Amino acid sequence: LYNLAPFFTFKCYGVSPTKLNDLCFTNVYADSFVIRGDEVRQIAPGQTG
Amino acid sequence: NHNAQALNTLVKQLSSKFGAISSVLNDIFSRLDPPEAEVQIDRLITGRL
Amino acid sequence: NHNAQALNTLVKQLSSKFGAISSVLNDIFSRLDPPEAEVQIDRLITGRL
Amino acid sequence: SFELLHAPATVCGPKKSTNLVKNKCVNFNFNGLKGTGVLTESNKKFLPF
């Protein structure tokens, strides 16, 4: 995911991105959608949009 | 009885998060980078002290 | 008198912010995002305890 | 979206396993749980979940 370089923003709310590889995760789900650039902030916990 | 109760209370107190993500320190270190981890650990250390 | 003074001090301490944005819990919830609000509320809870 | 260390994990990082050692003080990383302890066979029982 990091290898792709479109100047993407990786924000992890409850974990750190470097630490992801070490940890073993359960109940992993990926949600994919297209939104406007200004709206990216709204896709965050407790944000009103 | 009073001595037993006090010791049991301390053991019970270990479970308390104190506002941290988890009671277990190793989980905090494993899941978080050093800057965020320091804040969470500080909360646990203060509560245990 | 000493018992009365102690109780009065305890009631007064409720007003103190303890480094949180506001003494009132509702004000903190209303004006802050849920993660930050939790941190500020934790500061009030610990001070009151 | 994922939950951490509360159930058996089907998704894991690239870390390579090492043969277990029993009856010795050892550092352990069992499915992302890190601790230092003596590991012994348990006469107790566990449910599948």
The residue of chain A nearest to residue D6, with distances taken between CA atoms, is: A26
Method in brief:
cryo-EM
**B22, B23, B25, B1: which is closest to B13 by C-alpha?**
B23
Q: Is residue A37 less than 8 Å (CB to CB) from chain C? A: no
User: How far is D42 from chain A, CA to nearest CA, in Å?
Assistant: 24
Other C-beta atoms lying within 10 Å of the C-beta of residue B22 = 16
State both tokens at B16. Answer: 């308390």
Q: Do A45 and D25 meet the contact criterion of CB atoms below 8 Å apart?
A: no
Q: Are C14 and C20 in contact (CB under 8 A)?
A: no
Q: Does A23 touch chain B (CB under 8 A)?
A: yes
For C10, C39, D31, the CA distances from C15, given in Å and listed in that order, are: 10, 18, 47
**A19 in Cβ contact with D26 (< 8 Å):** no
Taking a C-beta distance cutoff of 8 angstroms, is the pair B32, A16 a contact? Answer: yes
Q: List phi, psi (to 5°) of D38.
A: -85, 130
The single-letter code of the amino acid at B16 is S
Residue A19 near residue B32, CB atoms below 8 Å: yes
Bridge partners, residue D35, by sequence: D28
Between CA A14 and CA C34 the distance in angstroms is 14
What is the rounded distance in angstroms from the CA atom of residue B20 to the CA atom of residue A13? 14
Q: Does D9 touch chain B (CB under 8 A)?
A: no
Host H or E run for residue D29: strand D25-30
Please choose, from the candidates D29, D11, D32, D9, the residue with its C-alpha nearest in 3D space to the C-alpha of residue D20: D29
Tokens representing A49? Answer: 């949009």
CB contact under 8 A, B26 and D34: yes
3-state secondary structure of D25: strand
**Residue D41 β-bridge partners:** none
> Residue B19: phi, psi to the nearest 5?
85, 0
HSE of D15 in the Cβ direction (CA atoms, 13 Å)?
A: 17
**Which residues sit directly before a break in chain B (C to N > 2.5 Å)?**
none
